[PDB]
Amino acid sequence: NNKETGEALLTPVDATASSHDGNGPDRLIDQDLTTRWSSAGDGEWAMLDYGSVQEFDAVQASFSKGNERQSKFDIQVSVDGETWTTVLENQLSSGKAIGLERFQFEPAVKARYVRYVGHGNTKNGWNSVTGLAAVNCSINACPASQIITSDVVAAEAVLIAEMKAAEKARKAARKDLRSGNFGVAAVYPCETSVKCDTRSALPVPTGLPATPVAGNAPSENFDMTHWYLSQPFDHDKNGKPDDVSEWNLANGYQHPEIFYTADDGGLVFKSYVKGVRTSKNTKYARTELREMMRRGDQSISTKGVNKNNWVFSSAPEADLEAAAGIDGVLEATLKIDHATTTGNANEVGRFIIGQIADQNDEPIRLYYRKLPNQPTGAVYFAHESQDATKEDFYPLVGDMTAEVGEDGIALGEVFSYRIDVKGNTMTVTLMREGKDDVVQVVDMSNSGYDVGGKYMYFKAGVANQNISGDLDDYSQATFYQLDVSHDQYK
Ligand SMILES: O=C(O)[C@@H]1O[C@@H](O[C@H]2[C@H](O)[C@H](O)[C@H](O[C@H]3[C@H](O)[C@H](O)[C@H](O[C@H]4[C@H](O)[C@H](O)[C@H](O[C@H]5[C@H](O)[C@H](O)[C@H](O[C@H]6[C@H](O)[C@H](O)[C@H](O[C@H]7[C@H](O)[C@H](O)[C@H](O[C@H]8[C@H](O)[C@H](O)[C@H](O[C@H]9[C@H](O)[C@H](O)[C@H](O)O[C@H]9C(=O)O)O[C@H]8C(=O)O)O[C@H]7C(=O)O)O[C@H]6C(=O)O)O[C@H]5C(=O)O)O[C@H]4C(=O)O)O[C@H]3C(=O)O)O[C@H]2C(=O)O)[C@@H](O)[C@@H](O)[C@@H]1O
């Protein structure tokens, strides 16, 4: 009954979404395979509004990276846009095509609103769709080619090649930003002024002022014995960030461009778009601290369930004991001085200010994000779970669209955060003077961070999440508190 021919599809009057990352729902109906609506988390939806009641019996949808993974979804319809009928369930896209694919049901239904309800894909927890449309196969083309068969794949070959040549060019443009050949020359206390005993633990700093003081080195305002600093320039030309070890940081290290005490005592981190990066697994530069519970004793390794890292108290007994501590609290107070104003729809204005990471994934990445056109910014966080097959975002002040108007956190405004892990429960709190705390509690029982062999460390500072803006654009934050604690086994 399906024909190769038919009249034009209806144009939706409105496309909306429960959420997105800046790649908004307007990108579903633009017929461009080069744009996408993206959102993360089971049950997130995009909705086509047709303006009045119409008749449909199918949808056509093209999928972001549709040839590398399969998306999972339902489709639902409504007359009122309050009561929802499910017409297609546990659909799985083909994984073989980036062009349109049809998902058809019998019989037709009457609806004004049609909704895509996403359940991630087979690789990660993202719902990412390049085109969606409700279709009536009595009047509209429902061609054969939208059923993905070997010959549809062969027919995609020219499109695939052109996409890949554009990927390749962007990858080359990104590579040009990564020389690390910039910034004034660093001065390392361990090479210049201090004999550093890298086979011992640093002393515990005492007499740290309650409020950071201008003209103090960061290690005089904060306990810098349990961090190393990742710096985005590469002055010894090994292709890697020039890292500042705990013995250096704890003896007064500062870099006057990117890591230094401000004129009110705050610790400033600045991160440009440009720089070398920590590995091929990220696209982004960072100017960020990485927790080192060995605290300067370099006989202990950086990586491993060992005396440099902690574990959740819900981990197996062997891990609980082999770790330097169990559970953890990071508490920080800071203000954002500047957010990138250039870059693409999901990256502009976005960076990370706190993390907990294991070898591969992040139990949390705390973002701040300000859009160049909004007068305040958003703070929200991600919990990645189940070996990175799942990802959920939780708002704190606004959400990942960062469309907060006047209601978010302004450049210059001081606020606090707390990341608190006790076993398989993470509590994240956002504090602001004269306002109520905002709290999100994350149940991690099924997150798989207690399975055994996973080691944890905190991070704080500014990890850029923008590789697409101008090379010299930057994001910058000033911290006034950085307090880390852990429990001990028995
Ligand atoms: O539809 C869609 O799908 C679309 O998706 C959406 O996009 C989102 C998706 O999620 C998407 O997947 C993507 O996600 C990516 C994002 O990037 C995201 O933020 C996230 O990023 C994470 C990842 O984890 C990522 O991998 C990276 O991790 C960082 C991590 O933060 C840490 O930095 C960590 O650091 C490591 C690392 O190896 C690093 O290089 C470094 O190694 C150093 C260091 O100095 C160590 O101390 C150690 O030192 C040793 C050395 O040998 C040293 O020389 C010395 O040696 C000693 C020693 O004794 C020796 O043996 C010898 O005798 O000599 C001595 C001497 O010489 O001194 O000391 C040693 C020692 O052990 O002490 O190792 C060195 C070294 O160089 O090896 O530090 C380690 C460390 O652990 O500290 O890892 C890095 C890393 O890169 O791995 O970033 C994070 C992050 O910041 O977030 O995940 C990404 C992903 O791809 O999964 O993007 C998302 C978004 O964009 O949002 C949307 O696009 C949507 O629109 C679409 O729909």
Residue numbers in the entry: 4 to 493
Authors' description from the paper:
In heterotrophic bacteria that use alginates as crucial nutrients, alginate lyases depolymerize alginate into alginate oligosaccharides (AOSs) and then into monomers for assimilation into the central metabolism. The noteworthy structural differences among the solved PL7 structures are the loops around the deep cleft, which are variable in length and sequence and involved in alginate substrate binding with the deep cleft. Structural study on several PL7 alginate lyases reveals that two loops around the substrate binding cleft determine product distribution.
In a previous study, we reported a multidomain alginate lyase AlyB, which contained CBM32 (a carbohydrate binding domain) and a PL7 catalytic domain (named CD2AlyB). One intriguing feature of AlyB is that its CBM32 had little effect on enzymatic activity but rather specified that trisaccharides were predominant in the degradation products when these two domains were combined with an alpha helix linker. Surprisingly, the structure of AlyBH360A_Y466A-G9 complex was solved at a resolution of 2.25 Å, binding the longest substrate among all solved alginate lyase structures and providing the substrate binding profile from subsite -3 to subsite +6. Structural comparison demonstrated that there was a clear linker twist that occurred upon G9 binding, which not only shortened the distance between CBM32 and CD2AlyB but also enabled the ligand-binding region of CBM32 to turn toward the end of the “-” section of CD2AlyB, effectively blocking sugar extension. Analysis of the detailed interactions between AlyB and G9 indicated that a total of seven residues from CBM32 were involved in substrate binding, of which six residues formed hydrogen bonds and Trp129 formed hydrophobic contact, and more interestingly, they all formed interactions with the sugar unit at subsite -3. In contrast, only three residues from CD2AlyB participated in substrate binding at subsites -2 and -1. For substrate binding at the “+” section, the conserved residues in the PL7 family (corresponding to Arg289, Arg293 and Gln358 in AlyB) also formed interactions with the C-5 carboxyl group at subsites +1, +2 and +3, and a similar substrate binding profile was observed after structural comparison of the AlyBH360A_Y466A-G9 complex and the A1-II’-GGMG complex. Additionally, the “-” section of CD2AlyB accommodated exactly three sugar units because of the blocking effect produced by CBM32, which led to trisaccharide release during substrate degradation.
